[PDB]
Structures are given as C-alpha cells and as structure tokens.
PDB file of C-alpha atoms in Angstrom:
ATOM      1  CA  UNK R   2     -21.403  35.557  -1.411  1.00 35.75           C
ATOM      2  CA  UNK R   3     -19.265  32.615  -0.724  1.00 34.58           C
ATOM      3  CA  UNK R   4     -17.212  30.902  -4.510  1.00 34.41           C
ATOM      4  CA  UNK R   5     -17.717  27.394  -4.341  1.00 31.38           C
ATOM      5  CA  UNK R   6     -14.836  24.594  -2.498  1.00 35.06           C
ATOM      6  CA  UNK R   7     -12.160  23.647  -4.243  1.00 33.86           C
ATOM      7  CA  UNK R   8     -12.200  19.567  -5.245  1.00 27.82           C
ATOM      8  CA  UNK R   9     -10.615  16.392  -3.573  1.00 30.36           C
ATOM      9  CA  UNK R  10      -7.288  15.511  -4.070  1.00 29.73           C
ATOM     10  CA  UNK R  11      -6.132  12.284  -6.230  1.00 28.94           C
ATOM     11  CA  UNK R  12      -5.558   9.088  -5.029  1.00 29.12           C
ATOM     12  CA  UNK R  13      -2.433   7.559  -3.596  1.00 28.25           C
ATOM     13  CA  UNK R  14       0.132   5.253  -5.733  1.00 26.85           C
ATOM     14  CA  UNK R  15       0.003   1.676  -4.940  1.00 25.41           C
ATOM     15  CA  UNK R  16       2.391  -0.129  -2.720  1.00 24.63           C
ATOM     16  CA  UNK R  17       5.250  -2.102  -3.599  1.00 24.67           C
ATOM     17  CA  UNK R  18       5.640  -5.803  -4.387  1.00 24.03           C
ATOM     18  CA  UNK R  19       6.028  -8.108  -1.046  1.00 24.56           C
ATOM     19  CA  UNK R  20       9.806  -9.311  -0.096  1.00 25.11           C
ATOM     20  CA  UNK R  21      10.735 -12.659  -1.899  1.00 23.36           C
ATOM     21  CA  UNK R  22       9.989 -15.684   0.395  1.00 23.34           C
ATOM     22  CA  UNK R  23      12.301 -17.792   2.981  1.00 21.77           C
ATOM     23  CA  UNK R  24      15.126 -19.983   1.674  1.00 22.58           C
ATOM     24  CA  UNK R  25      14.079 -23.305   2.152  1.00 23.81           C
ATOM     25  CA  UNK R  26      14.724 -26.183   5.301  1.00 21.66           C
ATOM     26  CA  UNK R  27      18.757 -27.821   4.775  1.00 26.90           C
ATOM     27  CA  UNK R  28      19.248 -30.702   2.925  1.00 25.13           C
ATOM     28  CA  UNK R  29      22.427 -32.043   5.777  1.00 22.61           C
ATOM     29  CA  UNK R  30      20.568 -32.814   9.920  1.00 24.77           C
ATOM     30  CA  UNK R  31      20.101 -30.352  12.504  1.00 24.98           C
TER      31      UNK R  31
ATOM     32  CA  UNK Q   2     -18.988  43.408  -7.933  1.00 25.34           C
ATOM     33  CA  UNK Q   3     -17.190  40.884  -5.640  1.00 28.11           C
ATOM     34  CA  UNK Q   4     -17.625  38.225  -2.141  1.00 24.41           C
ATOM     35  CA  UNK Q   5     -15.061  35.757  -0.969  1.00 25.62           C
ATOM     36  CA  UNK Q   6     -13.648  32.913  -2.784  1.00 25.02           C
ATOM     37  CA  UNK Q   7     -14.195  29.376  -1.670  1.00 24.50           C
ATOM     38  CA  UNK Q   8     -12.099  26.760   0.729  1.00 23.44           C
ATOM     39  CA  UNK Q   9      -9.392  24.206  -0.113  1.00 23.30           C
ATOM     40  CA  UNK Q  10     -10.471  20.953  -0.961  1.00 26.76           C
ATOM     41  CA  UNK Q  11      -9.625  17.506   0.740  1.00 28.33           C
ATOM     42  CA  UNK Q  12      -6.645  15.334   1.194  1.00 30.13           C
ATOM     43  CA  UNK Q  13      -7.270  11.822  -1.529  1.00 30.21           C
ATOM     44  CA  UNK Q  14      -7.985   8.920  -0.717  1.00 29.32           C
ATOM     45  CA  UNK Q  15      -4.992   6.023   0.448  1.00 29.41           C
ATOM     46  CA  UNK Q  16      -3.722   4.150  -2.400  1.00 28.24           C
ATOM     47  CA  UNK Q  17      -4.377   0.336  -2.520  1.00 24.69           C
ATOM     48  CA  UNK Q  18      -1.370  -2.521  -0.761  1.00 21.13           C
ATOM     49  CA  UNK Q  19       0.833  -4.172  -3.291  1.00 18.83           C
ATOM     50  CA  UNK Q  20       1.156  -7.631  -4.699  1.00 20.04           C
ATOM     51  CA  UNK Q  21       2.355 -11.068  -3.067  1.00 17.75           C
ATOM     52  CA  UNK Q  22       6.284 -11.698  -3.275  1.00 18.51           C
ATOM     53  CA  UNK Q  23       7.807 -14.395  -5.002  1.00 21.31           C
ATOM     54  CA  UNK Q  24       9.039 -17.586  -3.881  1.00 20.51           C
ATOM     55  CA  UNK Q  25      12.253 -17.991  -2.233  1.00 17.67           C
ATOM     56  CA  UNK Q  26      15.235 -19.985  -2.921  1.00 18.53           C
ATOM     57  CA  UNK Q  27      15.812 -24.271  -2.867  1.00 17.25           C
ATOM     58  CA  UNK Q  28      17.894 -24.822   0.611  1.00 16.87           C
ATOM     59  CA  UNK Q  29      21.336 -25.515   1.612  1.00 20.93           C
ATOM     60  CA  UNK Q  30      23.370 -28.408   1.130  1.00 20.53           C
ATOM     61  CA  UNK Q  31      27.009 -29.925   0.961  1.00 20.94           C
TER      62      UNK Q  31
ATOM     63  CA  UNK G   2     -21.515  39.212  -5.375  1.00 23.25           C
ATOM     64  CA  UNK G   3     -20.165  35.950  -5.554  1.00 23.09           C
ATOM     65  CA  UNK G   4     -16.417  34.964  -5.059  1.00 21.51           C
ATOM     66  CA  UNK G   5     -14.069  32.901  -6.915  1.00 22.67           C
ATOM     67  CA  UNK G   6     -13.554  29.305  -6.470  1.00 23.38           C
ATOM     68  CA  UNK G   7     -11.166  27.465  -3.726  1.00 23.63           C
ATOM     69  CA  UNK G   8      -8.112  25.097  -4.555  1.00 24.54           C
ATOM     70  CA  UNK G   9      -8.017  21.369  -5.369  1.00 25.36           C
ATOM     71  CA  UNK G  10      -6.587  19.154  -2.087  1.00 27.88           C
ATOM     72  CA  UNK G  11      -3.810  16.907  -1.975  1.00 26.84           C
ATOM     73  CA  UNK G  12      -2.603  13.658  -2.736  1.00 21.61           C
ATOM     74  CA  UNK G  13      -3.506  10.719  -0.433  1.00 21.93           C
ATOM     75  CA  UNK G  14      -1.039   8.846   1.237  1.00 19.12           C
ATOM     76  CA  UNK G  15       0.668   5.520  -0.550  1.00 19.88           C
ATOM     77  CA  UNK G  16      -0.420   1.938   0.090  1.00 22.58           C
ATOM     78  CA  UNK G  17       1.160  -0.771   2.120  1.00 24.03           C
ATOM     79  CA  UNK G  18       3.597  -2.805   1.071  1.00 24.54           C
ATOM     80  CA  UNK G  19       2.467  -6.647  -0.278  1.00 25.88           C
ATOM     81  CA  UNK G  20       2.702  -9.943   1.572  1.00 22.41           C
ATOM     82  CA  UNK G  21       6.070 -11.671   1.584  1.00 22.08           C
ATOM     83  CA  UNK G  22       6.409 -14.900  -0.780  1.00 24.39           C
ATOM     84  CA  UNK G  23       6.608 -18.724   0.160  1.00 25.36           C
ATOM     85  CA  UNK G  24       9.572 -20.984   1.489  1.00 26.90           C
ATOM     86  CA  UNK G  25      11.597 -23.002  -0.996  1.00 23.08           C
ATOM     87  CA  UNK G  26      11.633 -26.391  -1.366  1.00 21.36           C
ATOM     88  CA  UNK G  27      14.143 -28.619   0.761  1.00 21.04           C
ATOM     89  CA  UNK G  28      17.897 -28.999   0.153  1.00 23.11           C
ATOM     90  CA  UNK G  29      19.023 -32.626  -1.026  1.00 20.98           C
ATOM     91  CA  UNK G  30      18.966 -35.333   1.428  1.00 26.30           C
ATOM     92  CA  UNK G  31      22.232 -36.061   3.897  1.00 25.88           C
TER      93      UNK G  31
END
C-alpha cells in the first residue's frame, strides 16, 4: 500500500576561492 | 482504489572546498 | 491499492572556503 520515497536532494555549490596571501617581510630593519 | 503516498527524500550531499588564494603583495619600503 | 510517490529532499550544505595564498617577496634592502 505504501507509493514509493521521494529522491535525494542535489549537491551543494562549491566554496569560494582562499584569501590572497601575506604582504611580504620590509625591505628597512626591525 | 487508493493507499498512502511515500516519504520525503534526503538532504544532498556537502559541496566540495574551494581553490588556493593567490599570492600576496612585494613588502614595504622607503 | 498503492499510493502516490513522496517528494525530492533538499540541497546539501556549501563547501568550505579554500586555503589562503603565499607571502610576497621581500621589500628592497635598507
């Protein structure tokens, strides 16, 4: 008596690109 | 002539992690 | 007899953001 499930839902989006990397170490001493 | 319809389905899968970041900047000077 | 057929699920969650990026090179000598 039961209808059959229902299917799976989609997958999620992919994640965004990674922050941009550190400035570089000063040219002057410290 | 009728029985009871069928479930929901599942939540999807997560979606995949995101690309590397870019490079950063040339350091400080002057 | 039978019933109808259940509902499609939802979408999975989104991915992770990606890796942050490398230092930059040096500032000028001083």
């Amino acid at each position: 008596p039961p209808g059959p499930p229902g299917p799976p839902g989609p997958p999620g989006p992919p994640g965004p690109p990674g922050p941009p990397g550190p400035p570089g170490p000063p040219g002057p001493p410290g | 002539p009728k029985g009871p319809k069928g479930p929901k389905g599942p939540k999807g899968p997560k979606g995949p992690k995101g690309p590397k970041g870019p490079k950063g900047p040339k350091g400080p000077k002057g | 007899d039978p019933g109808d057929p259940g509902d499609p699920g939802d979408p999975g969650d989104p991915g992770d953001p990606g890796d942050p990026g490398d230092p930059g090179d040096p500032g000028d000598p001083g």
